[PDB]
């Protein structure tokens, strides 16, 4: 068989991702949250979709069509920029910080799991920047945080913290050690 | 109850008369069934569009369920009760008569097509729209004094024919 | 020679071949659907 | 309001101006096969199976001629969707030729 | 000139293969065939099949070059592309998890219309009525269909609505000439702007749908004939008759959902249109109504059914071997009488149509020469022998009818 240039490059990059010995601040990724806990994290995170551009436009025209002719609490949503998440973390305004494992330059998000372990922020490296993108009206998100919450979802969030602490942080205490990628 | 009414299969209709004995059994199956009093066109169009008859095949096979194509089949199976044709079956179904218990178990159940009927682009979204329309047009009372929800069958069978 | 002008459809070829083919294909996809149902119940 | 306007109006122009428009030929008028036929048309028992022995589409009638005493006794003709479907296929898949009979 | 290449000129640029048409349009085969159905484009037969190819004797279908070359610039093709874009941009919304934006994509969706496609196909109104022959045959079939996962209920309800509009108009302006009840269904003939259309209606029984037939080809034919019928019916109503579209009474549609329902407001020439005037017919339960009440109302009679219950009546139409009531006021008929009164036009006597007796046969409204063979050429011997065999195969079948008539008449 004969493949294209770019196909050969991404296949070569795939086998290069495995066969090299890798520094332990990377490969701290790919030791990621399993299927049940990931689905359960999103069962909470899907309840806080940031109000999409169409929804925001129609509502704020509803404000105009009503209020100009003839009280609300602050609404809660997931928080999704890297400047803003690393702002929220270190201010301790973060209760659950979700980090993508696949980022275009890897160097972007390498400090973040260990800065979360430093601040005492209960983090989870979840699989897919696309999968984080879906819950946030963006193609990709790299990071998603949950600062404040409705009280109906509060107990579920606190348990999501404790499940992620037990499932992720306790199973992967060896991941701060051990250079990954020694696969023969 | 669903064996007696022969409604084990989903998307499947049947005719019954409602009396003081029938109504208590109706409250049990109310989360599984959607009921209502049909009109003359709902009945007549339903029988001339859908209809099964369980009888013998060529020579040996018994379980053939074919179609209400003929009226001479109606003669051979009913006949002497006064029923000769498919329209006469419609008569004894629309108007409560003597031969209703005879012909009700003759058209055993109906085979209604499901709503939307697909998993894809347009069909998922149309199923989403209808699925949220379900809980609005139907409620589960769950109490012992559950009021029996009757819906328009003229509108519903306009969707299912 | 006193001939009447008219239009003529030629017989669409492979009509019987494809007819029997579609007859078989429909039945095959039915059976494959049934096999899918059973194997999904083993999950 | 969908499709609720006249589009022809005062329309005199014919489309059979270029000799390449082959008009789709209205199907042959039905000749003596009614629910109540003169029973000489009713087929002999040998030819009932001989007709079923012949391959489809090389066959004179798409049906068995049948006698019925009553109009109520007329069955729903099962092979009716097949006939319109085959005509539809005959319109866009069968080659149209200008012939001189 | 330089020596021209052989197989690139005459029949090679006059015709193109299916594959070459599909490739040139850069359109899927399905969508190529969809446009071909809408535009009324068909394969054509060249005088040389191999000169139409690039030399090859091969199983090939040839389209007209200028026909496909004319299809390329067309709004319908562009709208098919727009449907493809919409398809992925919807599954983008659905596949992500956002429902509101997907629901909004439905709202911001226009669709292709088959309006301008008929102007270029049937430029004159009498030409459209020459096509309505085949158009009304699909549509009346699709009315008598159970809705499946192939074909939605909205499709069948809209088709039945057009069917009822057609039946209402033909019964309104009184345009029937011939009827013919067969095994297949019931044929009608109608002088619609004086050009005699023909169309078939099946019997109102459940129809067994085969899995063999392709309900994607038939849906596009329905889609073209449907719009064609909408424009025909607007033209008919707004010319000589009524407002379009007419309303329908809700509690009438609850009773019959046929032809006595669907009331129509406005703001003869033939003997058939003058028949049954000042006659009131009581149609019984036993007969099919919707196939019969159309004919009574078309000619000039009046209908009272057994079905409507679930006076002036002069005839009753009953199909039972034993009839119960037998009053002196009414005349008792098996429907064959109506099916003969329309065909003749002269009001046939009801003495051969009593309930309990066998009906009339119901006809449709539709040596030296062997020695002088020698001096003919082969191009005349072949043809003459073919014409002899064609007359022989007719006359022997006529002899078969005569022999069978004699063998039956003895019994």
Using a CB-CB cut-off of 8 Å, the residues of chain B touching E155 are: none
Give the tokens for residue A74.
Answer: 């602050």
Q: For testing the chain C interface, which of D54, D79, D97 should be mutated: the one with the most C CBs within 10 Å?
A: D97
Record: contact C27-E45, CB cut-off 8 A:
no
Give the resolution in Å: 3.3
Task: Check CB contact of E214 with chain C, cutoff 8 Å.
Answer: yes
Of E183, E230, E286, the CB nearest to D33: E183
Reading the block at residue E148, the tokens are: 């499946």
Experimental method: cryo-EM
Asked whether D72 and B85 are in contact (CB, 8 A), the reply is yes
Separation CA E336–CA D36 (nearest Å): 9
Residues of chain B positioned with their CB less than 8 A from the CB of D72? 71, 84-85
Q: Do chains D and A touch (3 or more CB pairs under 8 A)?
A: no
- Cis amide leading into E245 (omega within 30): yes
Cβ contact E183–D35 (<8 Å)? yes
Q: Which of C4, C11, C15, C22 to mutate to test the interface with D (most CBs of D within 10 A)?
A: C15
Distances in Å between the Cα of D82 and the Cα atoms of A60, D66, D77, D88, E15 are 57, 19, 11, 10, 31
Long-range contacts of E216-221 (CB under 8 A, 24+ apart): E216/E30, E216/E150, E217/D85, E217/D88, E217/D89, E217/E33, E217/E37, E218/D84, E218/D85, E218/D88, E218/E138, E218/E142, E219/E150, E219/E151, E219/E155, E220/E34, E220/E37, E220/E38, E221/D88, E221/E37, E221/E138
**Pair type for strands E186-190 and E197-201:** antiparallel
Q: How far apart are CA B92 and CA B115, in angstroms?
A: 29
Domain ranges for chain A, please list them.
4-184
Q: Which residues of E touch C23 (CB under 8 A)?
A: 212
CA distance D45 to chain B (A): 18
Q: Which of D75, D62, D66, D74 is nearest to D28 (CA)?
A: D62
E90·B125 Cβ contact <8 A:
yes
CATH of domain A4-184: 3.30.1330.30
User: E62 has which bridge partners?
Assistant: E17
Nearest Cβ partner for E45 among C10, C13, C23: C10
The token duo for E68 is 């496909």
Give the CA angle between residues D22, D23, D25 to the nearest 5°. Answer: 120
Q: How far apart are CA E235 and CA E227, in angstroms?
A: 13
| Closest residue on chain B to E89 (Cα) | B121
**At E95, is the secondary structure helix, strand, or coil?**
helix
CA–CA dist E158, E230 (Å, integer): 11
Q: Which of E211, E213, E214, E379 to mutate to test the interface with C (most CBs of C within 10 A)?
A: E211
Residues D64, D69, D75, D77: is their CA dihedral positive or negative? positive
Subunits next to C (3 or more Cβ pairs <8 Å) are D, E
C1 in Cβ contact with E384 (< 8 Å):
no
- The whole-angstrom separation of Cα B39 and Cα E256 is 10
Task: Identify the H or E element spanning B35.
Answer: none
């Amino acid at each position: 068989v004969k493949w294209p240039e770019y196909v050969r490059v991404q296949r070569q990059k795939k086998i290069l991702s495995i066969r090299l010995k890798v520094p332990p601040t990377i490969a701290q990724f790919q030791y990621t949250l399993d299927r049940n806990t990931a689905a359960e994290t999103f069962k909470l995170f899907n309840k806080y979709r940031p109000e999409t551009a169409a929804e925001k436009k129609e509502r704020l025209t509803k404000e105009a069509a009503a209020v100009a002719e003839g009280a609300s609490p602050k609404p809660y949503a997931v928080k999704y920029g890297l400047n803003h998440v690393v702002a929220l973390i270190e201010n301790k305004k973060a209760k659950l910080v979700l980090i993508a494992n696949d980022v275009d330059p890897i160097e972007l998000v390498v400090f973040l799991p260990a800065l979360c372990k430093k601040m005492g922020v209960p983090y989870a490296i979840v699989k897919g920047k696309a999968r984080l993108g879906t819950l946030v009206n963006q193609k990709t998100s790299a990071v998603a945080a949950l600062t404040e919450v409705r009280a109906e979802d509060e107990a579920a969030l606190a348990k999501l913290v404790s499940t992620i602490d037990a499932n992720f942080a306790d199973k992967y205490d060896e991941v701060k050690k051990h250079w990954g990628g020694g696969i023969l | 109850i669903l064996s007696l009414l022969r409604l084990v299969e989903t998307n499947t209709g049947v005719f019954v008369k409602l009396t003081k004995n029938v109504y208590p059994l109706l409250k049990v199956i109310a989360p599984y069934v959607v009921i209502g009093k049909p009109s003359l066109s709902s009945i007549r169009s339903l029988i001339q569009k859908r209809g099964r008859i369980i009888y013998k095949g060529e020579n040996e096979a018994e379980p053939h369920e074919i179609v209400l194509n003929d009226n001479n089949i109606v003669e051979e199976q009913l006949g002497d009760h006064g029923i000769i044709c498919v329209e006469d079956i419609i008569h004894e179904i629309a108007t409560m008569g003597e031969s209703f218990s005879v012909c009700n178990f003759f058209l055993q159940p109906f085979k209604l097509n499901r709503e939307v009927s697909g998993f894809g682009s347009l069909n998922r979204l149309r199923k989403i729209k209808q699925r949220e329309a379900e809980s609005r047009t139907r409620q589960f009372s769950n109490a012992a004094t559950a009021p029996v929800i009757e819906v328009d069958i003229d509108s519903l069978l306009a969707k299912l024919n | 020679l006193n001939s009447n002008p008219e239009i003529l459809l030629r017989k669409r070829r492979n009509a019987d071949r494809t007819r029997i083919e579609r007859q078989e294909l429909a039945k095959k996809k039915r059976e494959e659907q049934i096999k899918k149902k059973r194997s999904n119940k083993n999950k | 309001e969908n499709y609720q306007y006249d589009l022809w109006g005062d329309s005199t122009e014919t489309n059979d101006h270029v000799m390449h428009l082959r008009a789709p030929k209205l199907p042959p008028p039905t000749n003596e096969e009614s629910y109540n036929p003169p029973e000489e048309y009713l087929l002999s028992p040998e030819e009932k199976e001989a007709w079923e022995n012949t391959e489809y589409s090389e066959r004179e009638r798409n049906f068995i001629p049948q006698k019925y005493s009553a109009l109520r006794k007329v069955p729903g003709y099962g092979e009716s969707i097949r006939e319109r479907f085959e005509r539809s296929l005959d319109l866009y898949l069968a080659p149209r030729v200008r012939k001189n009979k | 000139m330089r020596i021209k290449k052989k197989n690139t000129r005459g029949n090679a640029r006059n015709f193109i293969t299916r594959s070459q048409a599909v490739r040139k349009l850069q359109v899927s085969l399905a969508d190529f065939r969809r446009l071909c159905i809408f535009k009324g484009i068909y394969p054509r037969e060249p005088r040389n099949k191999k000169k139409a190819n690039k030399g090859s004797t091969a199983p090939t279908t040839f389209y007209y070059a200028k026909d496909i070359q004319y299809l390329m610039h067309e709004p319908v093709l562009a709208k098919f592309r727009e449907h493809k874009t919409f398809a992925r941009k919807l599954t983008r919304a659905l596949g992500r998890g956002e429902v509101s934006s997907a629901k909004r994509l439905e709202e911001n969706r226009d669709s292709y219309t088959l309006d301008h496609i008929i102007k270029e196909r049937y430029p004159s109104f009498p030409d459209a009525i020459r096509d309505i022959d085949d158009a009304l045959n699909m549509l009346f079939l699709f009315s008598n269909l159970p809705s499946t996962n192939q074909v939605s209920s909205k499709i069948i309800n809209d088709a039945q609505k057009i069917c009822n509009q057609w039946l209402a108009y033909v019964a309104k302006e009184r345009l029937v000439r011939k009827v013919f009840v067969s095994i297949k269904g019931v044929y009608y003939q109608a002088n619609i702007k004086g050009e005699e259309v023909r169309w078939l209606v099946p019997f109102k029984f459940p129809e067994n749908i085969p899995s063999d037939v392709d309900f994607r080809i038939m849906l596009t034919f329905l889609e073209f004939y449907s719009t064609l019928l909408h424009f025909v019916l607007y033209k008919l109503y707004t010319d000589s008759g009524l407002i379009y579209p007419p309303k329908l009474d809700l509690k009438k549609d609850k009773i019959i959902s046929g032809l006595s329902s669907y009331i129509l407001e406005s703001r003869y020439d033939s003997p058939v249109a003058s028949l049954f005037s000042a006659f009131v017919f009581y149609v019984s339960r036993e007969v099919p109504i919707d196939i019969l009440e159309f004919l009574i109302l078309s000619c000039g009679g009046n209908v009272i059914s057994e079905a409507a219950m679930d006076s002036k009546v002069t005839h009753q139409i009953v199909d039972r071997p034993v009839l119960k009531n037998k009053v002196a006021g009414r005349t008792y008929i098996q429907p064959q009488w109506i099916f003969d009164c329309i065909n003749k036009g002269e009001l046939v006597p009801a003495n051969k149509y009593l309930p309990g007796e066998a009906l009339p046969p119901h006809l449709s409204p539709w040596e030296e020469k062997k020695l002088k063979m020698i001096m003919m050429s082969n191009k005349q011997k072949k043809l003459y022998k073919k014409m002899k065999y064609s007359n022989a195969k007719k006359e022997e079948q006529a002899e078969n009818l005569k022999k069978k008539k004699k063998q039956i008449a003895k019994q």
